[PDB]
């Protein structure tokens, strides 16, 4: 548990439906959502691989569970069920205990995906932006659509806004 989901970001966004993780920017030009496509695609690939690993790693053979025994062979019968029930027990203890664990793991995975996304932009904005809580930032300068597009892309160009940000922050 990394403290990003149900942590410093209390709730999710219903309006951002085309991804799992995203940004919400607010400018003079306007406000808007933008899902992060790369992280969402990587997470989708991971979840798909996990589901396929759970599903397609059980290859069985043609068997016919079920045998007929008369009165004169009860031990025989009592052995057969001891096999059958036994197998069921194992599977019923594995599958039920399997899903649970991966469920937890999945709920950790998404959390990490959010947390890293919060860290990456932090390392990009530095002192040029101030954390206002709720897991997001307020800029010390004027960011147009180009600035926020660059922040989302991964190339903020910190030095260019450094001096105005310094002038506005030292207040």
């Amino acid at each position, epitope marked *: 548990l990394f403290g990003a989901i149900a942590g410093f970001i209390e709730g999710g966004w219903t309006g*951002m*439906v085309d991804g799992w993780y995203g940004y919400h920017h607010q400018n003079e030009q306007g406000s808007g959502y933008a899902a992060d496509q790369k992280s969402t695609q990587n997470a989708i690939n991971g979840i798909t691989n996990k589901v396929n690993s759970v599903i397609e790693k059980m290859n069985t053979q043609f068997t016919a569970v079920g045998k007929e025994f008369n009165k004169l062979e009860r031990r025989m019968e009592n052995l057969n069920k001891k096999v059958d029930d036994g197998f069921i027990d194992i599977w019923t203890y594995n599958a039920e205990l399997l899903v649970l664990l991966e469920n937890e793991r999945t709920l950790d995975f998404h959390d990490s995906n959010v947390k890293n996304l919060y860290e990456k932009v932090k390392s990009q904005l530095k002192n040029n932006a101030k954390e206002i809580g709720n897991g997001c930032f307020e800029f010390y300068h004027k960011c147009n659509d180009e600035c926020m597009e660059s922040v989302k892309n991964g190339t903020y160009d910190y030095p260019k806004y450094s001096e105005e940000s310094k002038l506005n922050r030292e207040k």
Partner: antibody
Amino acid sequence: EKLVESGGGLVQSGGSLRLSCVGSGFDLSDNAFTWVRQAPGKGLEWVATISTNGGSTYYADSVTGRFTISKDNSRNTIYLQMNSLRTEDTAHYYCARYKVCHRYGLSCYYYGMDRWGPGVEVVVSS
Amino acid sequence: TVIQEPAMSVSPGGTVTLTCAFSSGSVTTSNYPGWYQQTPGQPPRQVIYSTNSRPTVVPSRFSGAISGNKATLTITGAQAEDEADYFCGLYKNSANIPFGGGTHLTVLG
């Protein structure tokens, strides 16, 4: 299910246009849309896209900050407001509708565009 | 980026193939290679979506597949109404679908 495009023409450099596309035969509330352009002597280039509910919006790196794609569900219309047009914006513009895909509860952009529009020729000059 | 061939030709009733490849990589089924047909004066039409899936309306002369890390569109028995520009749209982890330059198929008459 057809898309009809309109609102383009000859505009001066530094001006603005508002291309509009009207869809007849379906509802826009559950489909994602895109605007694509073909420059003269060049291949098809992605311009902008809007999600199913209109919340998410993505722009090409060359037209960011100048183009705004919006959706009006009441009129069944998709608008591309183009501002501060430059000479490189001369093209033929198509409005296309993304095919419906649903991956783990999320809307997709995998399969491409199923319904395109006839296109509108936008030319700028000085 | 996506690379196609500038122009190709086919005689009527002849089978032709159009290729679509990345400039610096390979094209797999996860790229969802779509094929769009564009005639002059009319909207482009999605001939192929996904690797091989074809819409009902589209004739069955058009089939597609991934061969040699390259998407391919095969037209078996090219009629006279298949003289258009064919564009290949690939998927790269975003709504930004890169398109090919275009291939002008000339049905010789």
